[PDB]
């Protein structure tokens, strides 16, 4: 039928008319009077209303909105506040430097002012005001100026105050672990842990290839290294994981880094606390397998297949970022630095001093370049890939964490049970090495580390990492005391990995007898008992190590990898990566007895 084909050829317009038929019939029923049924705009003499430049009136003629002489619209109907006329308000009070949050679901939440670690800042919070029914405070913690403005979250989290012209910069400086090496697998049917990221997150844009690592296949051992000059970085692009070789997934070296997941979680936390997505910049800097001596600033060496050192490359990238931000009109602040080091120079006894000097030099350069007033928060996940003699790295890491220079999130062997180093099953033309984690392991590391950073920044509370503090020997029996954020500490029976002998304990003394541990047990939920093979009383340099026993002299596998067997009894909440319960596993440690 001609009418049928006519109606079929214009079905979209007919559907739109069907959707709007109510309005169409309402207009048609008053088509003659529609001139008098619309708003009327007319000018009136400005006598007696010199203050009210413009007037809006209702049907009865009463004033609804006016415009004052200074251009501020004033509503006759008062605007209800978002905290008093709508449910949900969290005010703040100051008690001896502590911030007490009022208006919560139950009892008040107390955020301490004095930080736990030695180098922590003593906050002196002052109630700046109320915004959106939430308490905005100002504290003496240097973020961009000498003081920082923060906003109280739903649970009391002092999130950084949102600012469109302020950009949060999250760095990742370290070995190939921070670069994102060999992390090209998340599940059987998905390669990237975070295929998409929320709004307002960027990396550096290059001429042809823009990515987390700024388009350089950085590798000290491999000769296919690349450097980036300031003239090549152009702008910013929307976030996302990017593989560098851009070849099939079997030949990809670096695909996904911890930076994407860390930035996504940080942005989500800030949005939850305040209500606005922050500006987050993602920059990953580093070269695989640098010694601690070559990461310095004074006596650094030149990267192979390159003409500049790693420190010079970092300075060039930071200067270009600052220039780009100045051109765009924003301000750059480095919120925190993600560090992963300790798999190459582990056999160096002076690792602590060199790492501290490098961290201090980088902090000074960042402060001078971006114009900040405080050091960025330095957090690092403890690596668990070293030879038998690779102990000085973790020892120095613990020493610097105690000294307050670093913040520890946890150990690297937790990925052994969460498919971190190897997925349940995939096609593997190359053998999956256990030193470099996959995308799932990178996501787990990023989640733990960003959680530690959020705890340090928002709550001003460093989450305690389960570690051995001191031990006392009594004949052929010894007792090791463990410090944890919850106090109660337990040994896991059936984890995802295998038991490391004496529940991951090792005894070493400067003697020819060296009685090894013959039994391990838990006496109380705080201390751990070790039964010696022979009496050890009266010896010298009696040292006890946890999560430091290893036998990987040629390759790293799931059985010879150093690992622990002991965690805390209180969970940290279900993770957002694999929906698996998070735990505070014990950091590798070495303690001299008393």
């Amino acid at each position: 039928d001609p009418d049928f084909v006519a109606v079929s050829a214009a079905l979209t317009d007919i559907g739109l008319v069907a959707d709007g038929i109510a309005d169409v019939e309402l207009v048609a029923d008053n088509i003659a009077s529609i001139s008098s049924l619309a708003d009327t705009s007319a000018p009136v003499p400005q006598i007696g209303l010199d203050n009210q430049e413009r007037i809006e009136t209702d049907a009865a003629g009463a004033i609804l909105r006016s415009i004052t002489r200074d251009g501020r619209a004033v509503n006759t109907i008062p605007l209800g506040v978002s905290g008093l006329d709508t449910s949900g308000q969290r005010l703040a009070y100051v008690t001896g430097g502590d911030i007490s949050v009022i208006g919560g679901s139950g009892a008040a939440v107390t955020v301490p002012g004095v930080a736990n670690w030695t180098g922590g800042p003593t906050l002196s919070p002052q109630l700046a005001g109320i915004v959106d029914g939430r308490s905005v405070l100002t504290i003496n913690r240097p973020f961009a100026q000498a003081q920082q403005a923060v906003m109280v979250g739903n649970d009391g989290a002092l999130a950084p105050l949102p600012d469109p012209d302020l950009v949060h910069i999250l760095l990742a400086d370290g070995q190939s672990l921070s670069i994102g090496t060999n992390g090209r697998w998340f599940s059987t049917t998905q390669m990237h842990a975070t295929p998409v990221l929320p709004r307002n997150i960027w990396m550096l844009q290059r001429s042809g290839v823009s990515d987390v690592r700024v388009g350089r296949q950085s590798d000290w051992n491999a000769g296919n290294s690349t450097q980036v000059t300031a003239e090549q970085i152009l702008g910013f692009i929307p976030a996302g994981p990017r593989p560098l070789p851009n070849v099939i997934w079997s030949s990809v070296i670096f695909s996904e880094s911890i930076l994407e997941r860390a930035a996504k979680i940080y942005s989500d936390r800030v949005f939850a606390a305040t209500g606005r997505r922050p500006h987050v910049l993602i920059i990953a800097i580093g070269v695989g397998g640098i010694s601690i001596d070559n990461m310095q600033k004074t006596g650094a060496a030149t990267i192979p297949n390159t003409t500049t050192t790693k420190y010079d490359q970092d300075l060039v990238i930071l200067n270009r970022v600052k220039a780009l931000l100045d051109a765009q009109g924003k301000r750059g602040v480095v919120v925190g630095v993600l560090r992963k080091h300790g798999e190459t120079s582990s056999a160096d006894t002076a690792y602590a001093t060199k790492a501290t000097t490098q961290i201090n030099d980088l902090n000074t350069d960042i402060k001078s370049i971006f114009g900040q007033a405080g050091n960025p928060i330095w957090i690092e996940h403890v690596q668990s890939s070293h030879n038998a003699a690779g102990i000085e790295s973790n020892k120095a890491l613990l020493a610097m964490h105690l000294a307050g220079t670093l913040h520890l999130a946890g150990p690297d062997y937790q990925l052994l049970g969460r498919q971190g180093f190897q997925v349940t099953g995939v096609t593997t033309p190359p053998n999956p090495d256990f030193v470099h984690p996959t995308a799932r392991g990178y996501a787990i590391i990023a989640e733990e580390m960003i959680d530690q950073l959020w705890q340090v920044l928002a709550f001003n509370r460093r989450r305690l990492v389960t570690r051995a503090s001191a031990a006392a020997a009594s004949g052929s029996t010894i007792d090791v005391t463990f410090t944890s954020h919850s106090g109660a500490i337990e040994a896991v029976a059936s984890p995802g990995w295998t038991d490391p002998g004496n529940l991951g304990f090792t005894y070493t003394d400067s003697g020819g007898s060296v009685p090894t541990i013959t039994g391990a047990s838990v006496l109380n939920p705080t201390t751990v008992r070790l039964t010696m093979s022979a009496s050890v009383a009266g010896r010298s340099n009696r040292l006890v190590r946890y999560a430091l026993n290893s036998t990987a002299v040629s390759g790293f596998t799931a059985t010879n990898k150093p690992r622990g067997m002991i965690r805390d009894t209180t969970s940290l909440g279900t993770s957002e990566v694999d929906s698996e319960t998070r735990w505070a596993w014990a950091v590798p440690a070495e303690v001299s007895v008393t």
Binding site: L37, A38, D39, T40, S41, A42, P43, V44, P45, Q46, I47, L49, D50, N51, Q52, E53, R54, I55, E56, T57, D58, A59, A60, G61, A62, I63, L64, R69, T76, I77
Partner: protein, 269 residues
């Protein structure tokens, strides 16, 4: 002016409705209107602008040590009674734009005995000395035994003597209100229209003014001559004043002119 926006489906506001008389709504809606002074808003000494308000508009202030002009009622209408003691000036603002303007006002003689009147002249305290290079509006009213003739002129070199723009002025009796409209434009020339109750009694046009007749200056003073306070002071009453930034006598704004006189005639005439 204040833009009054009216809504129909908005929330009710608890307050006294803001009412505006239809006269004000019609007057303020005139196209090209710039300034409007009404005797009903004349304070006890100063005359505030009505369209732009006291804060924004130019306030015609009395600037003499004689008795301040008062408000009078004539024939049921309200006027500013200038008995020769009032000099209402706009001090630090330009009342008209010399490029194109139209000044209309209602003047009511009150049984004049004085021969010469100067209702509108140059500003007495004016910054640039009025000479052959600085000329502004002047209105001269000559009395001949009960008959008034009006002349529009541009101020001369002396600052008091003015060169007339139009030649040939009809006489009207000194007991009726008169609407005087003086328009100037670059592409139209000078126009003058004087209207009485019976009808249009004077219509003059100078489409080719000379340099001495063209006006460059832009400040006016009401009720007295240029720095003369002896016998040239205006006698009578003054009514509504309207100043338009366009020329109402052009070929495109003619209808607008029809809307102006009809408003004035219904009000004072």
């Amino acid at each position: 002016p204040s833009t009054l926006i009216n809504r129909r489906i908005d929330f009710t506001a608890s307050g006294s409705p803001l009412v505006v008389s239809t006269r004000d709504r019609e007057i303020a809606a005139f196209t090209g209107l710039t300034r409007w002074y009404s005797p009903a808003d004349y304070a006890n000494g100063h005359w505030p602008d009505r369209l732009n308000g006291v804060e924004q508009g130019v306030m015609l202030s009395h600037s003499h040590s004689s008795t301040t002009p008062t408000t009078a009622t004539i024939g049921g209408d309200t006027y500013v009674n200038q008995a020769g003691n009032g000099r209402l000036v706009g001090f630090e603002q330009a009342l008209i734009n010399p490029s194109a303007f139209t000044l209309a006002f209602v003047w009511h003689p009150n049984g004049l005995t004085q021969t010469n009147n100067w209702p509108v002249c140059t500003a007495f305290d004016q910054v640039p000395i009025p000479d052959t290079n600085n000329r502004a509006l002047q209105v001269y009213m000559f009395n001949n035994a009960g008959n008034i003739q009006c002349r529009v002129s541009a101020s001369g070199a002396t600052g008091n003597a003015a060169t007339n723009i139009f030649s040939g002025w009809s006489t009207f009796p000194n007991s009726v209100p008169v609407i005087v409209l003086i328009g100037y434009s670059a592409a139209a020339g000078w126009f003058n229209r004087v209207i009485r109750t019976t009808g249009v009694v004077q219509n003059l046009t100078n489409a080719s003014p000379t340099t001495a007749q063209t006006i460059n200056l832009g400040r006016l003073q009401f009720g007295m001559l240029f720095q003369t306070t002896a016998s040239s002071n205006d006698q009578g009453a003054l009514g509504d004043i309207m100043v338009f930034d366009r020329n109402l006598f052009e070929a495109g704004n003619s209808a607008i002119l029809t809307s102006v006189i009809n408003r004035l005639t219904t009000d004072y005439l």
